[PDB]
Structure 1
């Protein structure tokens, strides 16, 4: 199996095969530890942000990939944002401080 950019899940935006075109491989915690033991942060950030969970980041990246510019403008992963909303829906006030 192989995938570049496929479909995406509605609830949380994450790669999901709907066409029998398969969803991406799952990058787990142990794998994250593997990237953590190596000195590679960017591989990991792009792994769990732009390549996957960032709804803006994925497209904003794709345009750069085709433009011939390799970068990332990561933003915030949609999962953690969903968790912000889920926590904040309770009587719990969660804020992002400073600047």
Structure 2
């Protein structure tokens, strides 16, 4: 099985998982550790923002790849924002900071 682009999950916009569904392989925590074992940071940033989570970014990446530019704009993984809402639904005010 192999997946380029297809269905995306609703609560978090990560791609679906499975064969009967047009899903992609899960990049587990052990794989993240192995990538960090090398100095690969751009690889990780792509793998966890553009390929999977940042909805606006993964389209601008698609356009650049078709255009032959091969440059990504990571933005921010939507799942993290979901987490923030999930914590903000409690009595916790967690927020980003400028400085």
Unaligned 5+ segments in structure 1 are none
Report the equivalent of 1:59.
Answer: 59
1:78 CA displacement:
0.8
> Which structure 1 residue ranges, 4+ long, deviate > 6 Å from structure 2?
none
1:77 CA displacement:
0.3
Distance 1:68 1:19, change over 3 A: same
- Partners in 2 of 1:23 and 1:61 — Cα distance? 19
Per-residue Cα deviation, 1:5-51 (whole angstroms, up to 9, x for no partner): 11101111111168945300000000001100011001111101100
Per-residue Cα deviation, 1:42-68 (whole angstroms, up to 9, x for no partner): 111110110001111111110111011
Unaligned 5+ segments in structure 2 are none
TM-score using structure 2 length: 0.92
TM-score using structure 1 length: 0.92
Report the equivalent of 1:21.
Answer: 21
Distance 1:98 1:66, change over 3 A: same
Aligned length: 99
